[PDB]
Design an enzyme around this catalytic site. Sequence first.
Site, PDB file in Angstrom:
ATOM      1  N   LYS A  59       1.053 -14.960   0.480  1.00  0.00           N
ATOM      2  CA  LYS A  59       1.313 -14.266   1.755  1.00  0.00           C
ATOM      3  C   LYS A  59       1.989 -15.253   2.696  1.00  0.00           C
ATOM      4  O   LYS A  59       1.553 -15.479   3.835  1.00  0.00           O
ATOM      5  CB  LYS A  59       0.029 -13.702   2.363  1.00  0.00           C
ATOM      6  CG  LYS A  59      -0.583 -12.599   1.501  1.00  0.00           C
ATOM      7  CD  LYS A  59      -1.679 -11.819   2.234  1.00  0.00           C
ATOM      8  CE  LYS A  59      -2.346 -10.749   1.350  1.00  0.00           C
ATOM      9  NZ  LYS A  59      -3.090 -11.347   0.187  1.00  0.00           N
ATOM     10  N   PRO A  64      11.518 -20.405   7.735  1.00  0.00           N
ATOM     11  CA  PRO A  64      12.320 -20.378   6.508  1.00  0.00           C
ATOM     12  C   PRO A  64      12.316 -21.624   5.640  1.00  0.00           C
ATOM     13  O   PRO A  64      12.061 -21.536   4.438  1.00  0.00           O
ATOM     14  CB  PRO A  64      13.716 -20.005   7.006  1.00  0.00           C
ATOM     15  CG  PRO A  64      13.409 -19.117   8.183  1.00  0.00           C
ATOM     16  CD  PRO A  64      12.266 -19.841   8.875  1.00  0.00           C
ATOM     17  N   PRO A 162      -4.251  -2.646  -4.931  1.00  0.00           N
ATOM     18  CA  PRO A 162      -5.579  -3.243  -5.067  1.00  0.00           C
ATOM     19  C   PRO A 162      -6.593  -2.253  -4.472  1.00  0.00           C
ATOM     20  O   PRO A 162      -6.231  -1.207  -3.921  1.00  0.00           O
ATOM     21  CB  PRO A 162      -5.485  -4.498  -4.204  1.00  0.00           C
ATOM     22  CG  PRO A 162      -4.624  -4.025  -3.039  1.00  0.00           C
ATOM     23  CD  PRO A 162      -3.570  -3.133  -3.710  1.00  0.00           C
TER      24      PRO A 162
END
Lengths: 207, 206
Positions: A59, A64, A162
């Site tokens: 996650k 960047p 999930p």
Amino acid sequence: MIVLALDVYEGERAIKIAKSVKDYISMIKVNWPLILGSGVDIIRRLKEETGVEIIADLKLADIPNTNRLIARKVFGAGADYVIVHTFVGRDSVMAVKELGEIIMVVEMSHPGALEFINPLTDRFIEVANEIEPFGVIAPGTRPERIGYIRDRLKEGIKILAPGIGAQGGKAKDAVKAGADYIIVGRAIYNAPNPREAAKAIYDEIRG
Amino acid sequence: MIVLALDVYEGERAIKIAKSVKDYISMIKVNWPLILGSGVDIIRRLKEETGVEIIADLKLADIPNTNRLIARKVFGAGADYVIVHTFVGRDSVMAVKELGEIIMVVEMSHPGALEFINPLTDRFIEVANEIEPFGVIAPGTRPERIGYIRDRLKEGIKILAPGIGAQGGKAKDAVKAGADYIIVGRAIYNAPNPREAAKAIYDEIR
């Protein structure tokens, strides 16, 4: 297709379990706790030992360049996909996609998700439609969300789900609603017989 | 007070640089790449070698339990503070705060931050005000954001400001404007003599 959330923070045991259930799973998903406890090389060990594709559920939500550095190391160790957030911006997402396949977060499962993330899900799906990642996650807890996302998501982008209920029929129903993969954890890795537990879920899906 | 962004990914080189500049900095900030390259134990070693507090810049953004597992391991390895995102919600932030001190992300400075994060900065500051973390990060690329955030941030919460210009007086202005800490990276770790570079910045701030 089953994605095993291999949240067994004992390296040797995790590898043994993954090898035992390989026949009935399509991917192994690893998280930061496992990487922290066993080193990022646990990913290469798993790749060499099982030959099963690996999703690194990181996650990522950094700038960047830092996302790029993390992706370089993790894809480098053997990950096939990296889970990245959409919230931080398209540049942060593309810095990871440049190095390997990605799965984007457009909606989350916990109570806190209702504060900022979930109210923006429609917009995050539009970003995923632009970027065309390998897939996105649809909290499979309550079905409706799998279909909700599927109805807004460009074809070609997969959905991993999930939180599927344990009731008979729930796994097959999630797939019928739009889930390409079902993410399963404890139901398999902490089962008396992990291989038989994975087989039972696999059989329902293919039944 | 200087926070060194120790973005040197060979752990022993990171330690060497940290040791050389330790007497001019308040904290050492480490990120995922360093942790991945040397192992999380690098946090314990940096603390032992320098005697300086460690910030783990992880920008946690997972569900509460995963945030908690990571925090337990990282604070357990010696981190004094963990940087967490505000956008994932209060419960995910509190899961970390229960185990140790936190610093919250309320604004970012890369172009992508304009898409979703920055439009919510005022709201994130309000969440930080209710949670009362040790501090928040105030991007200094636009130096006026330090004062903007300070004015809206609860008294008692600290501000750490990265991205301050190398032009004379800028770091000092940022501190006087509300930054308790100035986050410095390359200007120190890529300097011919990191110690002298750190001292130079320290002297400009004071």
